[PDB]
Amino acid sequence: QDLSEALKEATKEVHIRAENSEFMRNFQKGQVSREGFKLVMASLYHIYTALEEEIERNKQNPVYAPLYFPEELHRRAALEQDMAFWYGPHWQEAIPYTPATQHYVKRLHEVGGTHPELLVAHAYTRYLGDLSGGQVLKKIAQKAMALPSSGEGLAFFTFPSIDNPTKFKQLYRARMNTLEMTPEVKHRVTEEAKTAFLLNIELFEELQALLT
Ligand code: HEM
DSSP: OOHHHHHHHHHHHHHHHHHTSHHHHHHHHTOOOHHHHHHHHHHHHHHHHHHHHHHHHTTTOTTTGGGOOHHHHOOHHHHHHHHHHHHOTTGGGTSOOOHHHHHHHHHHHHHHHHOGGGHHHHHHHHHHHHTTHHHHHHHHHHHHHTOOTTOTTOGGGOOTTOSOHHHHHHHHHHHHTTSOOOHHHHHHHHHHHHHHHHHHHHHHHHHHHHHO
């Protein structure tokens, strides 16, 4: 069984739980406000910063290299633009760093520094989601908060280097199947992907609690 299929099958149930989390449920209803959106985007800034820092550390490592797509996927630069938009010129010292966010970042550095062979699980969970449900959220966010089609404030959800996300995802899944794979690595990677989904669910549950 190819890794791409193993990952889809391994995370299909927790995905349902994540897509139906209270924060996302409200988001999908269009009940997202500036305060809530700033909280999640600021948390993603910390998360993607840590993820991409570990990706850079392991870009030459064969256990990850085939999936090294900085130009097409990396979000840090986009998030820095969004942070300046939502938080202003001094966003660096204005944005929050919640406990759930720190926990996520913590696991990211553990994987990147000690278990690099599992890094693919974390890139898969965030990036492929960004190119799927993330595109739906972008549309909802634009309508709910009156964000311009010009993209300001939603740079994170925009991939100017990917003409067709559907096609890119297929390329990505295929590339995931070229990584050196053993029963040991395959089992652990699917396990870490489930953990990645849980870290996201816990972030959303936390943010929702902070807002309510
Ligand atoms: C906001 C609610 C969500 C919606 C509307 C949504 C919707 C979708 C849809 C329609 C697909 C299928 C795309 C395809 O076959 O190419 C998908 C795939 C995916 N989603 Fe979500 N999603 C949501 C939440 C999430 C969350 C919170 C995560 C984890 C951060 C996530 C990560 C993924 C991943 C990793 C895939 C790719 C699965 C695969 O093809 O192996 N999604 N999502």
